[PDB]
Amino acid sequence: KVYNSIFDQAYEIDPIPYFNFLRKHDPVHYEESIDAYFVSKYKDVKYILKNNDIFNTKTLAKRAEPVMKDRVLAQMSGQEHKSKKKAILKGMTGKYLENLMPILEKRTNDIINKHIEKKEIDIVNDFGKVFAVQSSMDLLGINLENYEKIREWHNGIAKFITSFNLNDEEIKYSLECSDKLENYLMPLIKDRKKSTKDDLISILLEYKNDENSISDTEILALSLNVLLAATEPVDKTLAYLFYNLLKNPEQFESVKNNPKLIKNAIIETLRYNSPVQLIPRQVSKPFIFNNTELQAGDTVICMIGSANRDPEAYSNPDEFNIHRSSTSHSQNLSFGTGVHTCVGASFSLIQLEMVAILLLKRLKNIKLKTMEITEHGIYTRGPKSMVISFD
Numbered sequence: 586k587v588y589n590s591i592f593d594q595a596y597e598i599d600p601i602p603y604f605n606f607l608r609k610h611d612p613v614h615y616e617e618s619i620d621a622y623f624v625s626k627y628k629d630v631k632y633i634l635k636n637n638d639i640f641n642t643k644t645l646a647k648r649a650e651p652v653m654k655d656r657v658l659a660q661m662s663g664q665e666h667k668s669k670k671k672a673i674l675k676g677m678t679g680k681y682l683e684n685l686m687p688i689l690e691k692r693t694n695d696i697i698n699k700h701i702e703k704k705e706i707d708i709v710n711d712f713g714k715v716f717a718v719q720s721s722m723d724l725l726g727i728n729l730e731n732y733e734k735i736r737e738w739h740n741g742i743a744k745f746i747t748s749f750n751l752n753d754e755e756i757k758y759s760l761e762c763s764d765k766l767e768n769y770l771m772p773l774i775k776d777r778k779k780s781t782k783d784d785l786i787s788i789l790l791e792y793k794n795d796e797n798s799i800s801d802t803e804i805l806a807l808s809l810n811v812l813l814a815a816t817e818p819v820d821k822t823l824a825y826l827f828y829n830l831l832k833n834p835e836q837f838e839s840v841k842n843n844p845k846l847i848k849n850a851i852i853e854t855l856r857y858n859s860p861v862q863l864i865p866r867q868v869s870k871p872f873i874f875n876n877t878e879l880q881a882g883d884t885v886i887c888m889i890g891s892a893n894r895d896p897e898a899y900s901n902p903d904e905f906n907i908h909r910s911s912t913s914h915s916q917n918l919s920f921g922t923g924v925h926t927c928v929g930a931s932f933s934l935i936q937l938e939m940v941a942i943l944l945l946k947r948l949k950n951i952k953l954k955t956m957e958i959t960e961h962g963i964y965t966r967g968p969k970s971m972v973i974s975f976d
C-alpha cells in the first residue's frame with residue numbers, strides 16, 4: 586500500500602526527502618517491521634510530548650532495563666520523577682557547575698594540545714568521542730583512568746538502545762558491556778558513600794525521599810542513564826556545528842565577529858541536524874491524528890529532525906541560518922518538551938559554547954577538509970568524520 590519506509594536504505598543516507606514526504610502525505614506513518622507509527626509533523630510531535638497521560642514512557646523499559654539493571658528517570662512520574670530529576674540537575678548547576686566547567690576546559694585544552702602540531706583534527710573522532718565520555722565521567726565523578734574501556738562499553742550499551750531489530754550476537758555484546766560497566770561502578774558507589782565527594786554519584790547517594798535513600802542498584806541505573814545520555818549527542822553536535830558554519834563562510838565570520846552569536850549557532854545546529862532523532866511513546870487509549878487511528882498499546886515515534894524542519898514551524902526550514910528570531914520561528918524540539926524535557930539542556934548549551942569558543946580561540950584560520958560528510962544512525966545521528974585544518 587505504501588512504498589516509502591523509514592527502513593529503506595536511502596533513508597539513513599539522506600532522510601530529508603523522507604521528512605518532506607511524510608509530513609505532506611503520511612504524518613502518522615505505520616512501519617510493520619517494528620509495529621510502530623512514525624510522527625513527522627511539529628504540531629503532532631509537540632502534542633504527543635506535551636500529553637504524558639495519553640502517550641506515556643512505558644515503552645522504554647523493554648529497550649532499557651536489559652542494559653540498565655534498574656529504573657530509568659524517563660520511566661518515573663509524579664513527585665518521584667520531579668524530585669529525582671531535580672537531584673540530577675543539581676549535579677550540573679550551582680556549585681557543582683562552577684567546579685566542573687574549569688575541569689571541562691582542562692579536558693578540552695588537553696585534547697587540543699595533543700593535535701595542535703599536526704595542523705588538523707577530527708572533530709568527531711579526535712575530539713568529540715574523547716571529550717564527551719571524559720566530560721560525562723567528570724560530571725559523575727569517575728576518575729579518568731579507564732576512559733578507554735568506558736568508551737567501548739558505552740558504545741555497546743547505546744547500540745542496544747538506539748537500534749531496531751538487533752541480532753542475537755549483537756544483543757549479548759551489549760549486555761556484556763552492561764555487566765562490565767556495572768562491575769566497575771558498583772564498588773565506586775560504595776566508596777563515594779564512605780567519603781562523599783562533590784559529584785553526581787554523591788548527590789544520588791545523599792538523596793532522601795521521606796528519610797529513605799535509593800538502593801545502590803537504582804543509583805547505578807541513574808548513573809548509567811546520565812552517562813549514556815550525556816555522552817552520545819556531544820561529538821555529533823560539535824561536528825555538525827563546525828561543519829555547518831564552515832559550509833556557510835559568511836555565518837562563520839559573523840560568529841568570529843560577535844562571539845555571543847555562538848549560542849544561537851548551537852541552537853540552530855540542534856534544530857537543523859538533530860542528534861537525537863527519535864522519541865518513542867506508548868499510546869494509552871484510543872486516539873486519532875488526521876484520520877489515522879491509534880489504539881491502546883500502540884507505539885508512536887516522534888521524528889525530532891522532521892518536526893524541527895516543519896515549514897509550519899519555521900520559514901525556509903531546510904536552510905542553516907544562525908540568525909533566526911521571532912509562524913516563521915518556533916522553539917525547537919531538540920531537547921524534547923513537556924514532563925521529560927532534557928534535564929541536561931542548560932548544561933549542554935554551556936558545555937558546547939565553552940568548547941566551541943576555545944576551538945575558535947586556539948585553532949587559527951580554520952579550514953574544512955571533510956568537504957562532504959557521511960551521516961549514520963536513525964535514532965541518534967551524526968557525521969562519521971569531520972576533519973578541519975588550522976595553522
Ligand code: HEM
Binds near residue numbers: 659811861924928930
Ligand atoms: C545536545 C545534547 C543533548 C540533547 C540533544 C538531548 C536530547 C534529549 C531529548 C530529546 C530528551 C527527551 C527524551 C524523551 O522525551 O523521551 C532528553 C531527555 C533526557 N536527557 Fe538529554 N539531551 C542532551 C544532553 C543531555 C545531557 C548532557 C544529559 C545529562 C547530563 C542528559 C540527560 C537526559 C535525561 C536524564 C533525560 C530524561 C529526562 C526525563 O525523563 O525527565 N541529556 N534529552
Ligand SMILES: OB(O)c1cccnc1
Binds near residue numbers: 927
Ligand atoms: O532519550 B534519549 O534517547 C537521549 C539520548 C541522548 C541524550 N539524552 C537523551
